[PDB]
Amino acid sequence: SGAIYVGNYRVVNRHLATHNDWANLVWEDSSRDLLVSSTTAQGCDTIARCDCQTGVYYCSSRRKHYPVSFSKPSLIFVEASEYYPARYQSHLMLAVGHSEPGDCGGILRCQHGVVGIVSTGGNGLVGFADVRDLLWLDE
């Protein structure tokens, strides 16, 4: 689990969005596994606006933060699951690192702030859904 709280928005993995998230939907994208909903309280997370390829992510399955080198957001084939059929997820970044079902939601951060959240994994590789291009989250 996990979410990004910026201004009056909450960003979660689309496959984990709650009834409250859908009832207050701002934007969702199945191809990116992202959902954004509105909040009444103010969020203080800072979104990175950069092209960083290094950062640190939180891995709940190990209660530890790990420094990673990651790829530029792209279209990557993601194996079938109970939430989605086998498809190409867009705006996805891979890193060599630990993850397991339950780690989605952990934040990836660089020196500029929040880069994205855990969305995929397997084979000793962790995938992160990029959020840096969602310029509207700050305005």
Ligand X SMILES: Cc1nc2ccccc2n1CC(=O)N1CCC[C@H](C(N)=O)C1
User: What residue has token string 């928005």?
Assistant: 9
Q: CA-to-CA distance for 69 and 58, rounded, in angstroms?
A: 14
Closest CA to 119 of 111, 131, 110: 131
Taking the complex as a whole, the smallest distance from the CB of residue 20 to Zn ion amounts, in Å, to 31
Q: Find which of Zn ion, ligand X, none residue 50 binds, CB within 5 to 8 Å per kind.
A: Zn ion
59 is catalytic: no
Which of the following is catalytic: 21, 33, 103, 130?
33
**C-beta of 17 vs 106, nearer to Zn ion:** 106
**C-beta of 8 vs 90, nearer to ligand X:** 90
110 binds Zn ion (CB under 5 A): yes
Q: Which residues, in sequence order, are bridge partners of residue 11?
A: 4, 36
Which of the following is catalytic: 21, 59, 103, 104?
104
Q: CA-to-CA distance for 102 and 83, rounded, in angstroms?
A: 13
Where does this chain touch Zn ion (CB under 5 A) — which range of 35-43, 70-78, 109-117, 120-128? 109-117
Cα 81–87–89 angle (5° rounding)? 100
33 is catalytic: yes
Tell me whether strands 25-29 and 34-44 are parallel, antiparallel or unpaired.
Answer: antiparallel
User: What residue has token string 């969305």?
Assistant: 119
Where does this chain touch Zn ion (CB under 5 A) — which range of 30-38, 50-58, 90-98, 122-130? 50-58
98 is catalytic: no
Residues of this chain that interact with Zn ion (CB under 5 A) are: 48, 50, 52, 110, 112
Would you list which residues are annotated within the binding site?
Answer: 50, 52, 110, 112
